[PDB]
Amino acid sequence: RILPFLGPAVIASIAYMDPGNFATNIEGGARYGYSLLWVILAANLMAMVIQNLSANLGIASGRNLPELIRERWPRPLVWFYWIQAELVAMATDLAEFLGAALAIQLLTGLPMFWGAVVTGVVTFWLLNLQKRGTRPLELAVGAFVLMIGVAYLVQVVLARPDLAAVGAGFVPRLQGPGSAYLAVWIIGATVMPHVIYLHSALTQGRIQTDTTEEKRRLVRLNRVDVIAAMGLAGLINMSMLAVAAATFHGKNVENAGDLTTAYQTLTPLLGPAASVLFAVALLASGLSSSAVGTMAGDVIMQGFMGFHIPLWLRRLITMLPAFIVILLGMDPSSVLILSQVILCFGVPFALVPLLLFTARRDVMGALVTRRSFTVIGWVIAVIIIALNGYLLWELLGG
Ligand SMILES: [Mn+2]
Ligand SMILES: [Mn+2]
Numbered sequence: 001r002i003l004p005f006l007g008p009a010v011i012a013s014i015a016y017m018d019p020g021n022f023a024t025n026i027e028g029g030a031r032y033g034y035s036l037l038w039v040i041l042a043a044n045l046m047a048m049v050i051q052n053l054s055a056n057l058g059i060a061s062g063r064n065l066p067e068l069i070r071e072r073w074p075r076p077l078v079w080f081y082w083i084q085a086e087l088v089a090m091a092t093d094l095a096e097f098l099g100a101a102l103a104i105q106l107l108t109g110l111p112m113f114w115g116a117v118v119t120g121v122v123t124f125w126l127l128n129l130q131k132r133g134t135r136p137l138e139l140a141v142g143a144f145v146l147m148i149g150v151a152y153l154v155q156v157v158l159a160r161p162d163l164a165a166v167g168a169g170f171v172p173r174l175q176g177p178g179s180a181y182l183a184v185w186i187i188g189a190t191v192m193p194h195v196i197y198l199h200s201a202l203t204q205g206r207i208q209t210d211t212t213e214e215k216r217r218l219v220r221l222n223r224v225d226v227i228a229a230m231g232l233a234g235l236i237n238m239s240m241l242a243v244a245a246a247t248f249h250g251k252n253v254e255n256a257g258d259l260t261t262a263y264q265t266l267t268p269l270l271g272p273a274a275s276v277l278f279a280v281a282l283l284a285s286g287l288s289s290s291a292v293g294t295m296a297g298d299v300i301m302q303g304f305m306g307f308h309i310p311l312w313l314r315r316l317i318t319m320l321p322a323f324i325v326i327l328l329g330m331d332p333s334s335v336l337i338l339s340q341v342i343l344c345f346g347v348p349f350a351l352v353p354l355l356l357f358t359a360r361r362d363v364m365g366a367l368v369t370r371r372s373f374t375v376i377g378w379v380i381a382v383i384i385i386a387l388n389g390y391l392l393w394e395l396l397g398g
């Protein structure tokens with residue numbers, strides 16, 4: 001037990017490598033080269049602070065975020081919070097589900113429907129682990145993170161990127177209205193609200209404590225786990241950018257956000273082996289982030305309302321929007337706009353209570369978050385909310 005909270009940290013980090021980030025990072029590389037690497041880095045650092053504040057809420061108060069809302073806020077407001085939190089968990093799981101089904105299509109050739117059934121069944125077995133023991137799930141998610149990191153490591157060696165061109169991409173410079181829009185879309189759609197509630201419960205009561213000094217030691221050993229777990233997610237997101245830029249930018253490639261076109265152009269440029277590592281890495285990202293999304297939903301309802309439904313019933317409900325899109329044949333860009341609108345709704349409603357309760361001695365006791373870290377959480381919050389509000393102005397304006 002050298003790293004006590006490494007499990008919850010790896011569980012929370014997988015939501016920031018979901019297939020939603022694959023489509024964004026690839027599109028940024030082909031259209032603008034490496035010149036967007038600074039945006040990927042900026043979004044990852046902001047996601048480390050928010051996820052660290054959730055884990056501390058559970059360690060200090062001995063209670064998770066949905067529990068404290070039920071206990072302190074009025075019943076009319078609590079019922080609304082449970083409602084919107086379920087809708088966001090279903091919105092973010094849609095992209096994690098469809099991505100896991102697309103990777104199977106690139107590796108085997110199966111249609112999107114049968115790919116979704118394969119991912120639906122394997123996600124059962126992942127949450128089947130955490131039923132009796134929560135540690136087997138922490139080992140499984142960690143194993144999937146090992147494959148995505150190794151797969152994109154070989155793609156960098158094969159792509160042979162110009163280091164001088166990669167370095168110039170970390171300079172915050174943007175040209176043309178297209179590149180600016182794509183950067184705003186990264187920072188606006190990065191933080192995962194469903195994993196904000198979940199991280200608090202995973203660390204809540206993980207180590208029994210009778211004093212306040214042993215809880216404080218748990219906070220220090222937890223931060224290293226979050227930084228290491230969230231840090232690895234950032235380097236992976238930058239690898240997707242570099243490979244797409246080192247191969248597609250100078251060759252005039254259109255429709256880069258679609259993971260199918262990016263998969264086909266890797267063979268004549270890099271080779272057939274470069275395409276396999278891409279799809280294998282996309283598969284481990286999808287089903288891992290989908291199984292975490294279900295465990296978050298169970299915590300949301302159990303804390304907000306006191307009762308809970310079985311896990312198999314929760315997995316069944318969240319799969320419903322996934323199969324509907326497959327049957328209707330919706331545009332991949334159309335589903336990323338509607339799902340992010342709901343994600344743009346859940347972000348403000350999640351960051352506000354997290355920044356309030358982690359700052360109240362009534363909740364945290366002698367482990368209140370430093371006010372210097374509370375203001376920066378609000379500054380990061382206003383930046384994200386404003387960008388989301390702007391993204392809603394064009395998404396709801398047409
Ligand atoms: Mn994500
Ligand atoms: Mn160029």
